[PDB]
Amino acid sequence: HHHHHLVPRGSNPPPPETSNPNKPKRQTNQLQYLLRVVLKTLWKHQFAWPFQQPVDAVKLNLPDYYKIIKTPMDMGTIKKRLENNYYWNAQECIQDFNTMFTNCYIYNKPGDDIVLMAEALEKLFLQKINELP
Numbered sequence: 001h002h003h004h005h006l007v008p009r010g011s012n013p014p015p016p017e018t019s020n021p022n023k024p025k026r027q028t029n030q031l032q033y034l035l036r037v038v039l040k041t042l043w044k045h046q047f048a049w050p051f052q053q054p055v056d057a058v059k060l061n062l063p064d065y066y067k068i069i070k071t072p073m074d075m076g077t078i079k080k081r082l083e084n085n086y087y088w089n090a091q092e093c094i095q096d097f098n099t100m101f102t103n104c105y106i107y108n109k110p111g112d113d114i115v116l117m118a119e120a121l122e123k124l125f126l127q128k129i130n131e132l133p
């Protein structure tokens with residue numbers, strides 16, 4: 001038989017929402033600091049780039065990524081959420097950061113380059129979190 005299963009193909013899932021009109025939202029001084037200080041200082045770091053957008057599992061040849069990671073998160077998503085005033089409190093935003101870092105540590109192994117990058121960014125994140133208003 002001549003069906004060789006070359007289609008249908010893989011794909012990326014849809015990315016996390018950055019808007020939700022029915023979700024409760026606030027602007028708080030902590031959320032303001034999270035955008036202006038925490039996110040913007042991590043964003044400029046030379047290890048930020050793999051984290052600035054959702055994982056493209058097709059481009060990056062990580063076909064197992066969304067098999068293993070079922071709650072993806074990334075800093076582009078967090079940035080957009082912050083810009084859109086998506087969050088109710090600082091905890092929600094912080095949980096998104098925690099999810100991003102945790103995903104990285106789940107998927108990868110100690111000493112992998114991506115893990116060294118995540119560890120550095122997490123260190124910086126935790127320092128910046130300790131001066132939250």
Ligand SMILES: CCN1C(=O)c2cccc3c(NS(=O)(=O)c4ccccc4C(=O)OC)ccc1c23
Pocket residue numbers: 050051055060062103104107108113114
């Ligand atoms: C942060 C999301 N992420 C991963 O968890 C991950 C694991 C393996 C490779 C890559 C990856 N591929 S990459 O080409 O951009 C890359 C980035 C940083 C360090 C190593 C690699 C890589 O795969 O080197 C071969 C991008 C984003 C992620 C990963």
